[PDB]
Amino acid sequence: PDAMIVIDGHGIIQLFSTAAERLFGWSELEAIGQNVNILMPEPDRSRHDSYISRYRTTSDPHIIGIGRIVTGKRRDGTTFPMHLSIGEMQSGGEPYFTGFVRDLT
Amino acid sequence: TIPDAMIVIDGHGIIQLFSTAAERLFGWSELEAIGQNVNILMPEPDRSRHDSYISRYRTTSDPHIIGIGRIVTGKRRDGTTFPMHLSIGEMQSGGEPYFTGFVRDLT
Amino acid sequence: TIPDAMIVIDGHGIIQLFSTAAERLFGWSELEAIGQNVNILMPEPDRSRHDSYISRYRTTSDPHIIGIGRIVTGKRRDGTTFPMHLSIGEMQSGGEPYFTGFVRDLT
Amino acid sequence: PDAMIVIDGHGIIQLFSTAAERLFGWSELEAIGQNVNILMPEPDRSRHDSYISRYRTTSDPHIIGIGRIVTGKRRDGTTFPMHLSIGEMQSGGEPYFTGFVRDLT
Numbered sequence: 001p002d003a004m005i006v007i008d009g010h011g012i013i014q015l016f017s018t019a020a021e022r023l024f025g026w027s028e029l030e031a032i033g034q035n036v037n038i039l040m041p042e043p044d045r046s047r048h049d050s051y052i053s054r055y056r057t058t059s060d061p062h063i064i065g066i067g068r069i070v071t072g073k074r075r076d077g078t079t080f081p082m083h084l085s086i087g088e089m090q091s092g093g094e095p096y097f098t099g100f101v102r103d104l105t
Numbered sequence: 106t107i108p109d110a111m112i113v114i115d116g117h118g119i120i121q122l123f124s125t126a127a128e129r130l131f132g133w134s135e136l137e138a139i140g141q142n143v144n145i146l147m148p149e150p151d152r153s154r155h156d157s158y159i160s161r162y163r164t165t166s167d168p169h170i171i172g173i174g175r176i177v178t179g180k181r182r183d184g185t186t187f188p189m190h191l192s193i194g195e196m197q198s199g200g201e202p203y204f205t206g207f208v209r210d211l212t
Numbered sequence: 213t214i215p216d217a218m219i220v221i222d223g224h225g226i227i228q229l230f231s232t233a234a235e236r237l238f239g240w241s242e243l244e245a246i247g248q249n250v251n252i253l254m255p256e257p258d259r260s261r262h263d264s265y266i267s268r269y270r271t272t273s274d275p276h277i278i279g280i281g282r283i284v285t286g287k288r289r290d291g292t293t294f295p296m297h298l299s300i301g302e303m304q305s306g307g308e309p310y311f312t313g314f315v316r317d318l319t
Numbered sequence: 320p321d322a323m324i325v326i327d328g329h330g331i332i333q334l335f336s337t338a339a340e341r342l343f344g345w346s347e348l349e350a351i352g353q354n355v356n357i358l359m360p361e362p363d364r365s366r367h368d369s370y371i372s373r374y375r376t377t378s379d380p381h382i383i384g385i386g387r388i389v390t391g392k393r394r395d396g397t398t399f400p401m402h403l404s405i406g407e408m409q410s411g412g413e414p415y416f417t418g419f420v421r422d423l424t
């Protein structure tokens with residue numbers, strides 16, 4: 001599952017793999033530091049922080065360990081179907097989330 | 106923060122993804138690392154034992170490093186070793202387990 | 213097992229030698245390539261960063277690609293891009309650094 | 320454009336540049352797979368494997384990074400003064416050497 005993205009518990013991109021660069025069009029340096037919400041169209045884009053926040057409060061997963069086909073958005077605005085799997089992991093008493101993204105095109 | 110040296114293995118210890126920073130630290134490119142057992146990145150005897158670490162974790166769900174991390178010793182392609190902090194997370198994709206390893210070089 | 217596409221640059225990224233298999237792959241004759249910056253064989257953002265990559269190496273002696281290797285994107289004369297594996301070595305001749313890059317087309 | 324030859328850790332020619340063809344007379348096809356010692360007169364020709372082996376053993380260079388004027392031998396039997404510079408390269412976990420050959424004639 002080629003394109004990999006790691007975010008912190010606020011949605012901020014920490015790692016952005018070479019497959020993610022080719023899929024999403026953002027260079028790794030550009031993507032790191034940006035909110036992962038840049039990688040999706042509305043309505044998900046404006047809602048994404050809520051999804052993270054809701055998970056952190058509730059611990060109730062919806063995509064983590066479940067996976068879902070969703071719409072992603074390339075740097076150039078174009079949208080594409082993709083499968084999303086997500087994992088969690090802790091470092092320093094903070095969570096980080098790893099996403100694997102499959103371009104269904 | 107989280108290290109940028111990241112390694113993804115499947116539930117058989119086979120490297121699936123090997124980040125640029127991991128390439129640099131271990132001295133393998135992803136081209137050569139993908140498909141090899143992650144045990145190539147460590148000295149003996151951990152190397153000979155590592156498949157059992159993974160396999161027994163899968164049957165017991167008793168983690169040792171997962172979620173807490175540990176200072177271990179890594180081995181580069183050229184056989185040189187280094188102290189490293191290892192962080193491991195677990196995930197599921199397509200109903201299969203994968204583990205995400207983050208490595209910080211302590212040289 | 214070493215690629216037959218081989219490029220040699222000086223310590224300022226300027227192409228010194230361009231093997232026949234580099235010519236095929238990148239679409240430049242050795243005659244046009246020599247004297248140009250190696251950055252012509254790559255897309256942005258690496259292209260406008262490449263001099264800095266070379267100079268950072270000359271400063272730190274800590275390689276990113278030398279002795280490790282990397283999959284990157286190369287760019288042909290015609291503007292089309294391709295996946296490639298890059299290996300790089302360092303040598304010295306007449307007291308100046310030169311870099312020998314070997315390119316494997318991953319298409 | 321100077322002549323360029325790549326050999327492996329046992330002195331076997333892996334690449335032989337157009338200028339090396341023009342200079343030494345051997346086509347790249349003919350040169351690849353032969354020992355680099357084909358390109359020199361005696362006694363270097365007989366001793367050359369031992370030069371490579373000592374370098375691999377000791378790491379004490381004599382020409383690598385140093386350069387020397389030596390004599391080179393053409394496919395057609397004739398010899399010629401030449402300057403030699405040698406680099407080391409690792410690819411796929413194994414040593415290669417790159418040689419640059421300046422014809423002094």
Ligand code: HEM
Nearest residue numbers: 005007039040051055061062063064070071072097098099
């Ligand atoms: C780029 C396309 C993405 C889309 C369209 C998307 C969409 C979604 C949606 C709809 C949810 C909420 C599920 C629900 O309430 O039904 C969600 C939750 C979440 N997403 Fe994203 N996401 C994307 C990328 C990512 C990536 C790449 C990561 C990690 C690096 C990530 C991390 C999370 C996390 C941690 C949650 C909360 C956990 C959960 O609800 O299971 N997302 N995402």
Ligand code: HEM
Nearest residue numbers: 112114146147158162168169170171177178179204205206
């Ligand atoms: C390269 C240097 C590494 C060394 C020296 C090393 C060593 C170890 C050791 C000694 C254990 C057993 C812990 C114990 O039983 O006390 C362990 C467990 C484990 N390691 Fe490795 N490891 C390394 C890299 C990695 C990486 C990069 C990953 C994932 C990509 C990984 C995945 C695992 C997993 C899944 C377990 C079982 C989970 C656990 O016990 O918490 N290892 N490792």
Ligand code: HEM
Nearest residue numbers: 219221253254258265266269275276277278284286311313
């Ligand atoms: C044509 C496609 C190429 C690309 C896309 C490329 C890109 C890069 C990148 C990404 C780095 C590391 C920068 C970093 O991670 O900070 C690098 C370093 C370097 N590259 Fe290039 N390169 C290419 C071709 C070559 C060639 C053919 C040579 C030699 C003839 C070369 C010589 C070097 C040197 C000397 C370094 C610094 C040494 C090091 O850090 O290991 N490049 N290059």
Ligand code: HEM
Nearest residue numbers: 324326358359370371374380381382383389391416417418
């Ligand atoms: C064609 C004419 C050549 C001659 C006469 C020649 C001669 C020599 C000599 C005399 C030495 C040993 C230094 C000493 O102990 O005095 C040497 C070492 C070596 N030569 Fe050659 N060589 C030739 C071509 C090449 C080429 C084209 C390569 C690489 C492609 C090469 C690779 C080496 C290597 C790797 C060593 C060991 C490194 C060292 O001692 O510095 N040689 N060669």
Ligand SMILES: [Cl-]
Nearest residue numbers: 067085198199
């Ligand atoms: Cl999944």
Ligand SMILES: [Cl-]
Nearest residue numbers: 305306386404
């Ligand atoms: Cl020299």
Ligand code: NA
Nearest residue numbers: 029030032033
């Ligand atoms: Na950034």
